[PDB]
Design a protein around this ligand. Structure first.
Ligand code: 95L
Length: 154
């Protein structure tokens, strides 16, 4: 029982793009861009679609950097999150109903206003290492269990 999601990180030499989630699940946290993958689109299609919906940005190339599985206690579907990075973007990011985008210096990541699991796996993304992760949550604050490792193939 799993469902595909995407997560897109615009990572440039000295800054990373994040959006403050305005509504929905996990609102009030700085997030990457992404969401559910729809029927009839590839995972990467879905990633590019969510990026454009949430920020207006398009990209020449997205690169697979990771995969994270989330379990929430009592919820039947696991989240199968495919994580992507890009450096070159096309456009200037703008606010959507869902996300307010801002750039952050790579030593000023707002981990305290981000999902707790970000503190574990995001530095690996910043270090340009591919990774597989698993995080078990009870609610949105408490990691009950996790595994994390670098991988050669995402
Ligand atoms: N940049 N990080 C995210 O956007 C992010 C990180 N962890 C999560 C864990 C569970 C979940 F439902 C969402 C996220 C998430 N969006």
């Amino acid at each position: 029982a799993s469902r595909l999601y995407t997560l897109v990180l615009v990572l440039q030499p000295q800054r990373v793009l994040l959006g403050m989630k305005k509504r929905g699940f996990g609102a009030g946290r700085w997030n990457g861009f992404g969401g559910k993958v729809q029927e009839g689109e590839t995972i990467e299609d879905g990633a590019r679609r969510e990026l454009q919906e949430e920020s207006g940005l398009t990209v020449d190339a997205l690169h697979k950097v990771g995969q994270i599985v989330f379990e929430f206690v009592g919820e039947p579907e696991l989240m199968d999150v495919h994580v992507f990075c890009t450096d070159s973007i096309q456009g200037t990011p703008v606010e959507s109903d869902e996300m307010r985008p801002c750039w952050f210096q790579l030593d000023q990541i707002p981990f305290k206003d981000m999902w707790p699991d970000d503190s574990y796996w995001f530095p690996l993304l910043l270090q340009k290492k591919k990774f597989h992760g698993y995080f078990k949550f009870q609610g949105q604050d408490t990691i009950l269990d996790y595994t994390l490792r670098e991988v050669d193939t995402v």
